[PDB]
A paper describes a structure:
Dual‐specificity tyrosine‐phosphorylation‐regulated kinase 1A (DYRK1A) was demonstrated as a promising therapeutic target for diabetes for its influence on pancreatic β‐cell mass and proliferation. In this study, we identified desmethylbellidifolin (DMB) as a novel and potent DYRK1A inhibitor. In conclusion, DMB from Swertia bimaculata was found to be a novel and potent DYRK1A inhibitor.
The equilibrium dissociation constant (K d) of DMB (compound 1, 5.11 ± 0.33 μM) with DYRK1A was much smaller than that of harmine (81.7 ± 12.8 μM), suggesting a strong binding. Enzymatic activities assay further confirmed that DMB strongly inhibited DYRK1A, with lower IC 50 values than harmine. DMB was bound with DYRK1A at the same binding pocket as harmine, adopted an extended conformation and occupied the whole flat‐shaped pocket. Hydrogen bonds were formed between 3‐hydroxyl and Leu241, also 8‐hydroxyl and Lys188. Besides, there were hydrophobic interactions between DMB with Phe170, Leu294, Val306, and Phe238. Interestingly, the conformation of DMB in crystal structure was almost completely overlapping with that predicted by docking. In crystal structure, DMB rotated approximately 10 degree toward the direction of Phe170 with 1‐hydroxyl oxygen shifted 0.958 Å, impairing docking predicted hydrogen bonding with Glu239. However, the shorter bond lengths of other two hydrogen bonds, and the closer distance to the hydrophobic environment of Phe170, favored the real conformation of DMB in the crystal structure. The crystal structure of DYRK1A‐DMB complex revealed that hydrogen bonding and hydrophobic interactions enabled the shape‐driven binding mode of DMB onto DYRK1A. DMB (75 μM) increased the thermal stability of DYRK1A in intact cells.
Author numbering: 135 to 407, 412 to 480
């Protein structure tokens, strides 16, 4: 028996629908599970509203990580400006029967759920544009110097709708997040959304989030992951099928560059060693998006906001996001100036 019988064998609190907490919270049900513990829907009898409570595991490591998350949300929740309103709001935090608990505003489903309710056909380029603009604003919030927060784990599942009918979104789950100051694994981000500098074991900064955003937007419009690596080597190879071989001057300083590429005698780089990939740069984003053939699936011929001209703007913005060079990858302020948004 664990924690006087309240935990199970994974350090997870045993959620019992209906329980009341501190004479304040009525636990409704489980809505989420992860390596950190659980998320319940709960009714805050005092404020008279539903909340999402995140119940960290009763175990020292996860508690220390979650304490990082809390300081980072308390830092964000110190800032005036209304950019902060695309980050999920921390309502409070407390210890309960040995678990650190984070009370959040209650939201609706995440964008991977939204994709499944379309049967992975994707949402329209207009909906994607509105998601893009919210997300860049949210990254611009994180970049403000006092914060300089890497989320470190952007993907559809961590972008939630506010309300199932509107298109407002907030970013959740700052449990793997860090400030420019702090760090570390280099094994961060989910594989499909992992920046190349992370794969090559280079130093990363806030720019890695902007890579993940690039891949998320494309996936939201086509329905399928742009780069679905089944492991690090496959990941980098799927990237290279689209963006070609990464600049020499970056590979020249990439600790794990020889995990994927051979330096030819002459100093230029190529891929290594029977179904081959597609030649570098040959699966062109132009055909993935369907720029000239009715958007993904042909399904958008003649729709409004999906003229070839809108698709060229989109492709431009994504490529600027999928820059290999993290010092020239488009930054939040300038993604918002792009003609995709005007
Ligand atoms: O913060 C989270 C969260 C939230 O703030 C509101 C909500 O309606 C759901 C949520 O679901 C999560 C999850 O499944 C994993 C990790 C998280 O941090 C969250």
């Amino acid at each position: 028996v664990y924690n006087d019988g309240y935990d199970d064998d994974n350090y997870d609190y045993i959620v019992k629908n209906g329980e009341k907490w501190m004479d304040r919270y009525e636990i409704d049900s489980l809505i989420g599970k992860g390596s950190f513990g659980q998320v319940v829907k709960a009714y805050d009898r005092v404020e008279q509203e539903w909340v999402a409570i995140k119940i960290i595991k009763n175990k020292k490591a996860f508690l220390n990580q979650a304490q990082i998350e809390v300081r980072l949300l308390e830092l964000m929740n110190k800032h005036d400006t209304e950019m902060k309103y695309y980050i999920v709001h921390l309502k409070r935090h407390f210890m309960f029967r040995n678990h650190l608990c984070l009370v959040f505003e209650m939201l609706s489903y995440n964008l991977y759920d939204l994709l499944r309710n379309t049967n992975f056909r994707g949402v329209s380029l207009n909906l994607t544009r509105k998601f893009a603009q919210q997300m860049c604003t949210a990254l611009l919030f994180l970049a403000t110097p006092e914060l300089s927060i890497i989320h470190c784990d952007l993907k559809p599942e961590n972008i939630l709708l506010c309300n199932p009918k509107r298109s407002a979104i907030k970013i959740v789950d700052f449990g793997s997040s860090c400030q420019l100051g702090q760090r570390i694994y280099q094994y961060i981000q989910s594989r499909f959304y992992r920046s190349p500098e992370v794969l090559l074991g280079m130093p990363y900064d806030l720019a890695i989030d902007m890579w993940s955003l690039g891949c998320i937007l494309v996936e939201m419009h086509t329905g399928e992951p742009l780069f679905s690596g089944a492991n690090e080597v496959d990941q980098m190879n799927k990237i290279v099928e689209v963006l070609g071989i990464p600049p020499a001057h970056i590979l020249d300083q990439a600790p794990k560059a020889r995990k994927f590429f051979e330096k030819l005698p002459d100093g230029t780089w190529n891929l290594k060693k029977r179904f081959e990939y597609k030649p570098p740069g040959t699966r062109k984003l132009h055909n993935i998006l369907g720029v000239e053939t009715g958007g993904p699936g042909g399904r958008r011929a003649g729709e409004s906001g999906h003229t070839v001209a809108d698709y060229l703007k989109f492709k431009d913005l994504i490529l600027r996001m999928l820059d290999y060079d993290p010092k020239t990858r488009i930054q939040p302020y300038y993604a918002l100036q792009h003609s995709f948004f005007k």
